[PDB]
Amino acid sequence: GAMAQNITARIGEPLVLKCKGAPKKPPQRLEWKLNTGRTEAWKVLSPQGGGPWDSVARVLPNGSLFLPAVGIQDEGIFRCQAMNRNGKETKSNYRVRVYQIPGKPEIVDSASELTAGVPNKVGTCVSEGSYPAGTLSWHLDGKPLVPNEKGVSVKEQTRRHPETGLFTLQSELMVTPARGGDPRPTFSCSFSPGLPRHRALRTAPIQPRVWE
Ligand code: NA
């Protein structure tokens, strides 16, 4: 695609996109073009508006495009093209990615006793309401726990809310505790949005007893 400004918009929240180089108020020679999950390729929106699109994306008096409540299907590309009073042409190019923050992750079905030297189901971490899916991961004593090594295995599951499209993630941790290890280890789970600069959410720890 072309060079664009990256926009991350939260689902359910309004979004205002500026049309650079447009006069402050009508009359304005400007045109918005968008290609999203709602469109068949490009769709043109004008200052006068009209039709079903007014509910979704509307041109404001200053020429900005306004979406009162962003949804998943609004992901895509938004372009404005405008001329000023001087006849100079100015283009605005936005890449819009949408997201939603899940609620705090939780550990369910956690074991209270582990036996060293054999595999143990430690617990199940669940995260509800994310977009995009993101990922779950486990930590032991404040350090990342890598699957498939050191007797550690993880199984993962992703489900989608039938109406909202938001993801629910589930992760089951199994460990084989080494002999002569910590009798009271501390495990925790965290959610990573994956989306740049978004912060992780962390579960409350679980502290099972380990039998030698
Ligand atoms: Na583009």
Short mmCIF file of C-alpha atoms and ligand atoms in Angstrom, two decimals:
data_model
loop_
_atom_site.label_atom_id
_atom_site.label_comp_id
_atom_site.label_asym_id
_atom_site.label_seq_id
_atom_site.Cartn_x
_atom_site.Cartn_y
_atom_site.Cartn_z
CA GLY A 1 0.00 0.00 0.00
CA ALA A 2 0.95 3.66 0.22
CA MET A 3 2.62 5.46 3.12
CA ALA A 4 0.01 5.96 5.81
CA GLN A 5 -0.41 7.14 9.35
CA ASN A 6 -1.13 4.19 11.61
CA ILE A 7 -4.32 4.53 13.66
CA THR A 8 -5.33 2.10 16.41
CA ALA A 9 -8.95 2.57 17.41
CA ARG A 10 -10.74 0.83 20.26
CA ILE A 11 -13.98 -0.99 19.43
CA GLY A 12 -17.07 0.86 20.70
CA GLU A 13 -15.26 4.20 20.88
CA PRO A 14 -15.69 7.15 18.49
CA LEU A 15 -13.02 7.92 15.92
CA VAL A 16 -12.28 11.25 14.24
CA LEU A 17 -9.94 11.32 11.23
CA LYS A 18 -8.57 14.67 10.09
CA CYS A 19 -8.72 15.72 6.46
CA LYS A 20 -5.50 17.71 6.05
CA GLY A 21 -5.47 20.75 3.78
CA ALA A 22 -9.22 21.39 3.83
CA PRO A 23 -10.80 24.78 4.62
CA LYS A 24 -12.14 25.19 8.18
CA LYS A 25 -15.79 25.20 7.10
CA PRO A 26 -17.95 24.61 3.97
CA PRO A 27 -17.80 24.97 1.07
CA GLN A 28 -15.00 22.39 0.80
CA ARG A 29 -13.72 20.49 -2.23
CA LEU A 30 -12.94 17.28 -0.38
CA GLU A 31 -13.64 13.59 -0.76
CA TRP A 32 -13.22 10.62 1.56
CA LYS A 33 -12.39 7.15 0.22
CA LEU A 34 -12.44 4.06 2.38
CA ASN A 35 -11.75 0.38 1.91
CA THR A 36 -12.75 -1.67 4.95
CA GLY A 37 -14.56 -4.84 5.99
CA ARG A 38 -17.78 -2.97 5.16
CA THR A 39 -16.88 -2.14 1.56
CA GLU A 40 -16.49 -3.75 -1.82
CA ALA A 41 -13.08 -2.20 -2.60
CA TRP A 42 -13.31 1.63 -2.45
CA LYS A 43 -16.36 3.52 -1.26
CA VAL A 44 -16.65 7.31 -1.67
CA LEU A 45 -18.08 9.51 1.12
CA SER A 46 -18.94 13.18 0.49
CA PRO A 47 -19.63 16.18 2.79
CA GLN A 48 -23.38 16.00 2.00
CA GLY A 49 -23.56 12.33 3.01
CA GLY A 50 -26.93 10.60 2.91
CA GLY A 51 -28.07 6.97 3.08
CA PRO A 52 -27.10 4.07 5.41
CA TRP A 53 -23.50 5.32 5.62
CA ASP A 54 -24.52 8.31 7.79
CA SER A 55 -24.99 5.90 10.73
CA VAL A 56 -21.45 4.61 10.37
CA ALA A 57 -19.15 7.31 8.99
CA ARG A 58 -20.08 10.93 8.48
CA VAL A 59 -18.17 13.98 7.24
CA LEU A 60 -18.02 16.77 9.87
CA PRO A 61 -18.21 20.55 9.15
CA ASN A 62 -14.41 20.83 9.37
CA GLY A 63 -14.10 18.02 6.83
CA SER A 64 -13.04 15.35 9.31
CA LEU A 65 -14.53 11.87 9.05
CA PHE A 66 -16.44 10.80 12.15
CA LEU A 67 -17.30 7.27 13.22
CA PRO A 68 -19.43 7.35 16.41
CA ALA A 69 -18.68 3.72 17.37
CA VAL A 70 -15.84 1.78 15.74
CA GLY A 71 -16.34 -1.92 15.01
CA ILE A 72 -14.21 -4.81 13.74
CA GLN A 73 -15.45 -4.26 10.16
CA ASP A 74 -14.02 -0.72 10.15
CA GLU A 75 -10.47 -2.07 9.84
CA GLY A 76 -8.85 -0.93 6.62
CA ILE A 77 -7.81 2.20 4.76
CA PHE A 78 -9.25 5.73 4.96
CA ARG A 79 -8.20 8.43 2.50
CA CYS A 80 -9.09 12.08 2.18
CA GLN A 81 -8.36 14.28 -0.79
CA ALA A 82 -8.97 18.02 -0.52
CA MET A 83 -8.16 21.38 -2.08
CA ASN A 84 -7.71 24.65 -0.20
CA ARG A 85 -8.83 28.14 -1.27
CA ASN A 86 -5.51 28.42 -3.13
CA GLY A 87 -6.14 25.34 -5.25
CA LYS A 88 -3.40 23.26 -3.64
CA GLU A 89 -4.18 19.56 -3.27
CA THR A 90 -3.51 17.65 -0.04
CA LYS A 91 -3.90 13.93 0.64
CA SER A 92 -4.45 12.13 3.94
CA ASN A 93 -3.85 8.39 4.26
CA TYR A 94 -4.81 6.36 7.33
CA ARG A 95 -4.35 2.67 8.11
CA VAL A 96 -6.94 1.86 10.79
CA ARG A 97 -6.53 -1.19 13.03
CA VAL A 98 -9.08 -1.91 15.73
CA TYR A 99 -8.70 -3.56 19.09
CA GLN A 100 -10.36 -4.42 22.36
CA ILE A 101 -8.88 -5.08 25.78
CA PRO A 102 -9.97 -8.32 27.44
CA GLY A 103 -10.89 -8.37 31.11
CA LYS A 104 -8.25 -9.40 33.64
CA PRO A 105 -6.99 -12.94 32.92
CA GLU A 106 -7.87 -15.65 35.45
CA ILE A 107 -6.48 -19.00 36.49
CA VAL A 108 -9.06 -21.77 36.87
CA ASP A 109 -8.72 -25.44 37.90
CA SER A 110 -5.31 -24.93 39.51
CA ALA A 111 -3.54 -27.78 41.29
CA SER A 112 -2.65 -27.36 44.95
CA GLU A 113 -0.17 -30.25 44.96
CA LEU A 114 2.48 -31.21 42.42
CA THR A 115 4.64 -34.32 42.43
CA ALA A 116 8.27 -33.83 41.39
CA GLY A 117 9.55 -36.01 38.56
CA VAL A 118 6.19 -36.57 36.85
CA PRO A 119 3.94 -34.42 34.66
CA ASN A 120 1.40 -32.33 36.56
CA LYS A 121 -1.48 -30.25 35.27
CA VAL A 122 -0.70 -26.89 36.90
CA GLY A 123 -3.71 -24.92 35.76
CA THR A 124 -5.77 -23.24 33.09
CA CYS A 125 -5.54 -19.57 32.20
CA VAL A 126 -8.54 -17.86 30.59
CA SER A 127 -8.83 -14.46 28.92
CA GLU A 128 -12.16 -13.10 27.63
CA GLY A 129 -12.96 -10.27 25.25
CA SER A 130 -9.86 -9.49 23.22
CA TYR A 131 -9.40 -8.24 19.68
CA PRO A 132 -7.19 -9.27 17.99
CA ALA A 133 -6.82 -12.63 19.78
CA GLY A 134 -3.49 -11.91 21.44
CA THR A 135 -1.70 -14.69 23.35
CA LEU A 136 -1.40 -16.25 26.81
CA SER A 137 1.91 -17.28 28.42
CA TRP A 138 3.09 -18.69 31.76
CA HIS A 139 5.68 -17.58 34.30
CA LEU A 140 7.52 -19.39 37.08
CA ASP A 141 9.03 -17.34 39.92
CA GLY A 142 8.92 -14.18 37.80
CA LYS A 143 10.55 -15.63 34.70
CA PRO A 144 9.07 -16.75 31.35
CA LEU A 145 8.18 -20.43 31.05
CA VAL A 146 9.07 -21.82 27.61
CA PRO A 147 6.87 -24.66 26.28
CA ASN A 148 8.40 -27.98 25.12
CA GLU A 149 11.59 -27.57 27.16
CA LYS A 150 12.47 -28.56 30.74
CA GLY A 151 9.42 -30.83 31.03
CA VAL A 152 7.03 -28.00 30.24
CA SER A 153 4.06 -28.40 27.91
CA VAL A 154 1.24 -26.03 26.99
CA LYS A 155 -2.05 -26.53 25.15
CA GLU A 156 -3.95 -23.57 23.77
CA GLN A 157 -7.47 -22.87 22.63
CA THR A 158 -9.17 -19.93 20.90
CA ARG A 159 -12.91 -19.27 20.72
CA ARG A 160 -15.00 -16.47 19.28
CA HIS A 161 -18.12 -14.81 20.68
CA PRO A 162 -20.85 -15.61 18.13
CA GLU A 163 -22.18 -12.02 18.08
CA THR A 164 -19.35 -9.63 18.96
CA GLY A 165 -16.48 -11.53 17.36
CA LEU A 166 -14.31 -11.01 20.44
CA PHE A 167 -11.83 -13.76 21.33
CA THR A 168 -11.65 -15.97 24.40
CA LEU A 169 -8.27 -17.62 24.96
CA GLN A 170 -7.53 -20.65 27.09
CA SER A 171 -4.16 -22.15 28.01
CA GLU A 172 -3.33 -25.29 30.02
CA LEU A 173 0.09 -25.60 31.65
CA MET A 174 1.75 -28.89 32.55
CA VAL A 175 5.13 -29.12 34.27
CA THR A 176 7.43 -31.89 35.42
CA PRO A 177 9.12 -30.43 38.54
CA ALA A 178 12.78 -31.29 38.94
CA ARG A 179 13.79 -33.17 42.08
CA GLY A 180 15.34 -31.03 44.80
CA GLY A 181 13.60 -27.98 43.39
CA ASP A 182 11.57 -25.22 45.06
CA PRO A 183 8.92 -26.80 47.33
CA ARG A 184 6.73 -23.71 46.94
CA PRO A 185 7.00 -22.46 43.32
CA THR A 186 5.02 -19.48 42.06
CA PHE A 187 3.21 -19.71 38.72
CA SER A 188 1.36 -16.94 36.92
CA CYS A 189 -0.28 -16.24 33.56
CA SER A 190 -0.25 -13.09 31.45
CA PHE A 191 -2.09 -11.77 28.39
CA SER A 192 -0.13 -10.11 25.58
CA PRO A 193 -2.18 -7.96 23.19
CA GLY A 194 0.52 -8.46 20.56
CA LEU A 195 -0.46 -5.04 19.20
CA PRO A 196 2.51 -2.60 19.51
CA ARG A 197 3.01 -0.81 22.86
CA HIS A 198 -0.12 -2.28 24.45
CA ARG A 199 0.59 -3.46 27.98
CA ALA A 200 0.26 -6.99 29.34
CA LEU A 201 -2.32 -8.02 31.93
CA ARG A 202 -1.23 -10.47 34.65
CA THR A 203 -3.10 -13.04 36.75
CA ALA A 204 -2.78 -13.46 40.48
CA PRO A 205 -0.15 -16.13 41.26
CA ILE A 206 -0.75 -19.74 42.25
CA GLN A 207 1.50 -21.36 44.84
CA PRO A 208 1.10 -25.14 44.97
CA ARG A 209 3.03 -27.50 47.22
CA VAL A 210 5.64 -29.73 45.54
CA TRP A 211 6.21 -33.27 46.78
CA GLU A 212 9.74 -34.65 46.57
NA NA B 1 -2.54 2.23 1.98
#
